[PDB]
Structures are given as structure tokens and as C-alpha cells.
Write a protein that binds this DNA or RNA. Structure first.
Lengths: 141, 223, 143, 67, 107
RNA sequence: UAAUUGCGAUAACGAACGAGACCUUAACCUACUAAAUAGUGGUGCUAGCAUUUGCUGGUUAUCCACUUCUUAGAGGGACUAUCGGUUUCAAGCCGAUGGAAGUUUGAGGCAAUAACAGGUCUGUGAUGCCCUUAGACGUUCUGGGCCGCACGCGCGCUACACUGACGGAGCCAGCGAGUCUAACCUUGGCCGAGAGGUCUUGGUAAUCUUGUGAAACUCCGUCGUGCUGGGGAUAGAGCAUUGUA
């Protein structure tokens, strides 16, 4: 058997856990599920990628994260990569890898640099100034 | 929820800070070098480092016992916990503070400045460091103000990987004319360091190639 | 036949609880309502002149079941309003304690929340009952 | 910008000048070869030198160079 | 009746970790010597000690600043073993740190 | 080119400091493998949309396993790496790329010789000189002022709703902070619209405060065309806290 696989990272205000243990299809991130979530305000990011793969896609995948995080837009940007991971992993290790790779090559130009390593952060604040790069105004004579 | 540790991890710092400051203040005539302390069960393994250990030892009870009693009463330990004992110095000519106090005495005993000044750096380069310099501020005549200096060998300053093998010794002297300040920063060899990064980042070395082989057909012999 | 795993909605739930508890009149409001300013950091008092107590009751009920524990300090700090503090940068400041104390006492008199270990109080066995049979199915048939 | 200093070119010269006939054009293989051979304390130079070495190897393969 | 169970938490004061690896190797060896079940060490986040100050005796002139930090780490390990082997680290092979601190910690 | 960074005929040759090299932080590995401090599964399962044992409170030696939720304790991180143009065709430089990245991968630290009559005798208990040392410029206790204002000068918050509030929905994630010569964090209960008296894990911090529980932002109704949820300068009463005052 396998106790736990490894994967984790840091969103702009959320973190990730390798708690994707064995399930039977359903997907729920305990804060914005697929079934009973109802935001009906900004669903473009879920209308975009779920076109020609299948709508149910509940076979043997289940994102079951005990902990949680996020802010006001980190959550939408986190469920974005969550559904990306779900779609790719549902076809990688269960449905045929032919289906996975053809679906990926179809969805080539839809991962807006979603495969990069986590290196997107703001900058620290430089001293002697008000903002980050901004500097205080001088006192000429 | 029983939650405090920065109150004591910094006490560990300020402890030997104050101690080595007091030692630099008191142990002048010896030519002091420094300390090193380790924490163990009911015995703080403390060591001082010295070049004239016989003087500070005295007649096995002239100074060490009273130093132990001083450090005892400073904190109210149990007499028997602390254990203050000296230790011989390796590379005696390399202790920057030692050479600084040496030059201090060579100045205060009434000797010409430049003679002993180049003498001590010649001596340490003979001992075999990588390089060293010396600078002295203040005045050396009925004059305004000057800053004499000189060096030999090679010197580097600066970046991150200089701090490991560069030394520092900035000291003062209170003469009849006015306060003067000397500074020395001896740079020791990198190869004989035996601790930490040996080679410089600038440095680089390439091992030698292999051996040569003529044609040598497979086999035609009697066996 | 009961509450699902996570059946939830927002403003419809709030208005439903409000209009449902309006015609009951079993809240037993204290009496000093509609004089307070809701916080020590409000710009002006409420303008409805009749309500908002019910709305805050519905609000706290809209996550007494969503979350395990609860706290009066947490409920105040949730909407510790921003003070228009004169010629000064604004700052958030905690809400009124009396309003939350009294609405919590009224909810306890009704029997929704009960003192319990692991911090203060907790949604009651009446909450278990109503998410089982009565309030779950009532909200199902109402929406 | 993408410009090299003294010591990298010096190391490249002294490296090829005793190991011409090895170190294939692949940059990762050049990396592993220089790691096996030399001991470059500057761990970033250990990877920087490989690019210039393979560049000079491409140059000599195209044709002779000066010096 | 010897060979008991304690699940004792023992403290230690240092900052490096190679001594901890040596101690774990030694206790794993002594536990394998008489088939005793091991226990993993403690693990915690790092830390930083910010002290913002000026770079001048008097505050005239420029407005530079300075900060520096530390990373000292006392540790404590949770070992399941009896007293006769708990007391062996400070005795057998004395080196800087490879010791044992007497303390009760099982409730 | 970031450059005394390199190419180069060269009365130059061979070396040093600076540059650079270097350290810190934002970085992935299905690992060497780690922590009842995040806590994890089959939780044996127990009260919760049923002929959907997975979780909601949790079983404080609940399993074989522990990092899978932080981390480095480490180590490999991944460089002009290919095409075009482009100059003794060598330095070097712009586009196309698959991709951790492609002004130096971003930013910070580290700083050359020679100087300034630059600031600091008010950090010194570091001092050369003179002054004071018994009617004290030494030190200590009571009270004022350093916040005083006819007038100018230099930072910074509020302001001219229409792109401005009230009841609510996100309180979730982020670098900090807290004692055996005892006063720091506040949890739910009570009257409290600024404090106050409770008992709580609290003084060797992923454990408790804060699950690091802010506002910014949007809509259900009420708010309008100004001097109304743009104004709050300047003043008058009252309830209070800290501190000997």
C-alpha cells in the first residue's frame, strides 16, 4: 500500500496539500464544490475548460483537502488550477493516456503558464520611501 | 501555553559577549585572544585562549581560582559547576587582537613607531599568513592630523566569503598627546584553513589528464 | 428527507429566516433597540426604524450551523465598523457588545445554541433535530 | 548582459588545452564532465563555464580559431 | 521486570543538527541491538529575529538602516526506551552535544 | 556589455583591489524521508441527504504508516540551449521557441586609493587644554517651560458624495508580538453603548492570542442633486481609563 504521496505549494493566499487520497468520483474542496456551490457571479473560469472531456467525470478521483486557505480572488485562482489538475489527472491515471495526451494537446493554449513553478510573488519594501519602489519627496531649499 | 525562548537564546549570546568584553578589559598584559563556551549538564565547558598562559596561571591558585570565584558570584552558581581553565594557542602570530595588544605595548614602552610597525608585520608574514596591513590614525608630531599605513603580501575586501578568513583588530591607545587608533586586518591562507570553504570563489583548479595508449592489437602470443 | 451534505444559499436564506421569524413574534426583544448605533464606530444609526435585529439573528444563524464553535468577540469583530475618526486615517473598531449579547440570549431562550465544552457554546441537539427533520425539510419546501 | 568575464574564458582555454578530444556538444554532458574533472568552488561557475566551453567547441568544429 | 515502556521526551540545547543525526544513528543502533521500535525526531518551522536600527551614532545625514537575525534551536526528541539506555548517551562516547538531559515527560 | 567585461595591431611583460565571483530570499523532487504544535487517512465506529463507512465533534499508546498540510536538516536547482539576422565572422546584441524562469532570473547585503578643517568632546565611565570643586558648571527632592506665537519656511493625514453609506458575504492566507525578583495574551457566562469581578491551555510560542478572524470591493431595500451616509476645523456639557500626579 501507499501511505501518502507528496505535493504542496503556495497560492497568493492559499496553500496545497497532497491529501488526494482514494475516492469514488466526487470532487469537493470543502469551500467551493461542483455540486452545491452556487456563486453565479464569476464562472467564466469553469465555463472555459470543461467542453469536450465529459461533464460528470466522477469515476475514481476525489480532492479531499482537510485544511483550507485563500482570500477574495486567490480562491478563484486556486479552483482554476484545481479543476486543471482534476481534468488532467482524471485522464492520466485512469482513462487512457492516449485520451490524456490528445486532450492536453487540444488544451495546449489554455494553460496560461499554469505549469510554471511557484515564483510569482510581490516585492519587499525599500526603506526611505512610502511604497515599495516609491521614495519620499525631497526638501529642496 | 508555556511559550518563551527568545528570552534565553539571546541571554546565551549576551553572556559570553559581556564575559569576553571583561576579559579584553582585564587581561591586557597577557596578550588576550578570545574565548569559547559550550553548555553541558551541570558543567559549562568554558575555555579561554592565551599565549602567555604561565602568567595568568601563576602558582596554580594565584589567578584561576579567584577568576572562578568571580564568575561564580557574578551569577550565583553552585561552586563546582563552572570550570575555568586556559588553553595553549595555535598559530600564535595570527591572533589579530594579540598582535594589536603587542603593538600597543611596543608603542607605550617608548619605541619608534614605524620600526616596530613594519617589524610586527614582517614577523607575522614570516609566521606565514597570506597577507596583512596596518593603519594608525591621529597625530605623530606637533601637527594637525594624519593617518599612516602600509601593508605587504595580498589583501581582499570585500564580499561575503571574506569574513571567514579575514581578521579584525581595531584598538586604541591613550598617549600623552592624544588618543590614537590602530587597525589591522590580517588575511590568512585559504588552503590551510581546515574549516569551511577552502578554495576562493575566484579560485579554480583542474586535475591532470589520464595516460596514453599505443595501438596494441588484441592478441598474438603463446599461452 | 433532511439536510444534504452542504446545502447552502445566502440572501435568499437570510430573507427567508427574516420573513419566517417575523410572523412568530417569539423573539422577545429587550426594548432598548432602535436607540443604539450598532457599534462604537458607526457613521449614523440604522434607518429602517424596524428590523435589523431580526436580520442579525438570521445572519448569526446562517453560520451557527456552518461553523462548529462561536464567539461573541468573533461576532463583534466580524463587522467591527470603520470609524470616520475626524481628521484621521480611518480604522476598524469592534462592534457593540450589548446587541450581540442580547440577540444571543434571545436565541438561547428560543433554544438554538447551548453551553458546551471545547469553547463556550455550540449548536444544540435542537439544531441536530432541525437539520434532521423540521428545519431542513421546511427550507427544502420553501426553496 | 549575456557577457563573460576573465576567469571563465581562462578556465575554458586551460580546460580544452588538456581535454580537447572529449566533452560532447551536449551542455549537460559537458557539465557532468567538468564536474568529474575539476573542483570549481563557485558552484554557479561550475555551470557557467560549460556554455562557453561548448561554444568554443562549436567554433573549432566549424573551423580554426585565433590563438 | 526490566525493559519497560516510557515514551519519554528528552531535551537538548544547541543549533546545528549533525549531532542530532549522530544521536539518532546511535539510538537506532542500540534499539536494533535488542529489537526496539524506533521513534522519529521533532520538526518545527524556522525563525527570524528582526531588529531594525539606524546606521549612525547621531541621526544626521542619510537615513540608512540595518537588520540582522539568528537561528538558534533547542530541540527535544520523543524516544520510546527504558532508563538504562536513556542514561547511556552522556556516558558512552562523549562529544560536544551527544549527551542526555534527565527529565520526566510521559503524561 | 553593467562595467578596466571581452576581441584586438600594439614598448610592453607579468600580477593585485574594485567589478565580478559570493551570501539571503520567491522558487520543483511524488524522495534521504521528518514532527498528537498543521495534522492525515481504512478513522472499529459512533447522533447527521439512505438499501452513496467518507466526513461533520471525537475515541488524549484508535491500527499497520507517519509528512501528506511548515521546513530545509540536506542534496540535483536548469545554461545563449537550437534557427535567423549580425561584426577581422571572434568578441557581443534582437525575434521564434518546448519550458521554473530568460534587463545580471527579480530584489537586498558585501564595497577600491586619495580626500572633506562634512556630523558627532550631548553614547560613553575614550581623552590632550583650560575652566568649576564648598556661595557647586558635581549630584539629589518641589514647581514651571522645552506644547509658549503679531509673522515665513520644509514632511505628512482630512477635503470638493454621483467613482460617497447603512443590516449582511467573504474573519479565510500573509512577515510579528507576550516574565519566578510577575504582570501578557485574551475564549464563553453574566450589567458594560470607553474600563471593569469571574474560571479557563498561558510563560522554556505551527500547541494558547489570531484556524495571523483587517479593510479595499459588490448586490437585496433605504439613502440625492449641497452645502444629507462630502464635509469635520473650531468650541460647550457628560460617562470613563492609564498613571503618585
Amino acid at each position: 500500500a501507499v501511505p501518502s504521496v507528496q505535493t504542496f505549494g503556495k497560492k497568493k493566499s492559499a496553500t496545497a496539500v497532497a491529501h488526494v487520497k482514494a475516492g469514488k468520483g466526487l470532487i469537493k474542496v470543502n469551500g467551493s464544490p461542483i455540486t452545491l456551490v452556487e456563486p453565479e457571479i464569476l464562472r467564466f473560469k469553469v465555463y472555459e475548460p470543461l467542453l469536450l472531456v465529459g461533464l460528470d467525470k466522477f469515476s475514481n478521483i476525489d480532492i479531499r483537502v482537510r485544511v483550507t486557505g485563500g482570500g477574495h480572488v486567490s480562491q478563484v485562482y486556486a479552483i482554476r488550477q484545481a479543476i486543471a489538475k482534476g481534468l488532467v489527472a482524471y485522464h492520466q491515471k485512469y482513462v487512457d493516456e492516449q485520451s490524456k495526451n490528445e486532450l492536453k494537446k487540444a488544451f495546449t493554449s489554455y494553460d496560461r503558464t499554469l505549469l510554471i513553478a511557484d515564483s510569482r510573488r510581490p516585492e519587499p519594501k525599500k526603506f526611505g520611501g512610502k511604497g515599495a519602489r516609491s521614495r519620499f519627496q525631497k526638501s529642496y531649499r | 501555553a508555556l511559550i518563551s525562548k527568545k528570552r534565553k537564546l539571546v541571554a546565551d549570546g549576551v553572556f559570553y559577549a559581556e564575559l569576553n568584553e571583561f576579559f579584553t578589559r582585564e587581561l591586557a598584559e597577557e596578550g588576550y585572544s578570545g574565548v569559547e563556551v559550550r553548555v553541558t549538564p551541570t558543567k559549562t565547558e568554558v575555555i579561554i585562549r592565551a599565549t602567555r598562559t604561565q602568567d595568568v596561571l601563576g602558582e596554580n591558585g594565584r589567578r584561576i581560582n579567584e577568576l572562578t570565584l568571580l564568575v561564580q558570584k557574578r551569577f550565583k552558581y553552585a561552586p563546582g559547576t563552572i570550570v575555568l581553565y586556559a588553553e595553549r594557542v595555535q598559530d600564535r602570530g595570527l591572533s589579530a587582537v594579540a598582535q594589536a595588544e603587542s603593538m600597543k605595548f611596543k608603542l607605550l614602552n617608548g619605541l619608534a613607531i614605524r620600526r616596530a610597525a613594519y617589524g610586527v608585520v614582517r614577523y607575522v608574514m614570516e609566521s606565514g599568513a597570506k597577507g596583512c596591513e596596518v593603519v594608525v590614525s591621529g597625530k605623530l608630531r606637533a601637527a594637525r592630523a594624519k593617518a599612516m599605513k602600509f601593508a605587504d603580501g595580498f589583501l581582499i575586501h570585500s564580499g561575503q566569503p571574506v569574513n571567514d578568513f579575514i581578521d579584525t583588530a581595531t584598538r586604541h591607545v591613550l598617549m600623552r598627546q592624544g588618543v590614537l587608533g590602530i587597525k589591522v586586518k590580517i588575511m590568512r591562507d585559504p588552503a590551510k584553513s581546515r574549516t569551511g570553504p577552502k578554495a576562493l570563489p575566484d579560485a579554480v583548479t583542474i586535475i591532470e589528464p589520464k595516460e596514453e595508449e599505443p595501438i596494441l592489437a588484441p592478441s598474438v602470443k603463446d599461452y | 428527507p433532511g439536510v444534504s451534505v452542504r446545502d447552502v444559499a445566502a440572501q435568499d436564506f437570510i430573507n427567508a429566516y427574516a420573513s419566517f421569524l417575523q410572523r412568530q413574534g417569539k423573539l422577545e426583544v429587550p426594548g432598548y433597540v432602535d436607540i443604539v448605533k450598532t457599534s462604537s464606530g458607526n457613521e449614523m444609526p440604522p434607518q429602517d426604524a424596524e428590523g435589523w435585529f431580526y436580520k442579525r439573528a438570521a445572519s448569526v444563524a446562517r453560520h451557527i450551523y456552518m461553523r462548529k464553535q462561536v464567539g461573541v468577540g468573533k461576532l463583534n469583530k466580524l463587522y467591527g465598523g470603520a470609524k470616520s475618526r475626524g481628521v484621521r486615517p480611518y480604522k476598524h473598531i469592534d462592534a457593540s457588545g450589548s446587541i450581540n449579547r442580547k440577540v444571543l440570549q434571545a436565541l438561547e431562550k428560543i433554544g438554538i445554541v447551548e453551553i458546551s465544552p471545547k469553547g463556550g457554546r455550540r449548536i444544540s441537539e435542537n439544531g441536530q433535530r432541525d437539520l434532521d427533520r423540521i428545519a431542513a425539510q421546511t427550507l427544502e419546501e420553501d426553496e | 548582459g549575456r557577457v563573460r568575464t576573465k576567469t571563465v574564458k581562462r578556465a575554458s582555454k586551460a580546460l580544452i588545452e588538456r581535454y580537447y578530444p572529449k566533452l560532447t556538444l551536449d551542455f549537460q554532458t559537458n557539465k557532468r564532465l567538468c564536474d568529474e574533472i575539476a573542483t570549481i568552488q563557485s558552484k554557479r561557475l561550475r555551470n557557467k563555464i560549460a556554455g562557453y566551453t561548448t561554444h568554443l567547441m562549436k567554433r573549432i568544429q566549424k573551423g580554426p580559431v585565433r590563438g | 521486570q526490566q525493559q519497560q515502556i516510557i515514551k519519554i521526551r528528552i531535551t537538548l540545547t544547541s543549533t546545528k543538527v549533525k549531532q542530532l543525526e549522530n544521536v539518532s544513528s546511535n539510538i537506532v543502533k542500540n534499539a536494533e541491538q535488542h529489537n526496539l521500535v524506533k521513534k522519529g525526531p521533532v520538526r518545527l518551522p524556522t525563525k527570524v529575529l528582526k531588529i531594525s536600527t539606524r546606521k549612525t551614532p547621531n541621526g544626521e545625514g542619510s537615513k540608512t538602516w540595518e537588520t540582522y537575525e539568528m537561528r538558534i534551536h533547542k530541540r527535544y526528541i520523543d524516544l520510546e526506551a527504558p532508563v538504562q539506555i536513556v542514561k547511556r548517551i552522556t556516558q558512552i562516547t562523549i562529544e560536544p552535544g551527544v549527551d542526555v538531559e534527565v527529565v520526566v515527560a510521559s503524561n
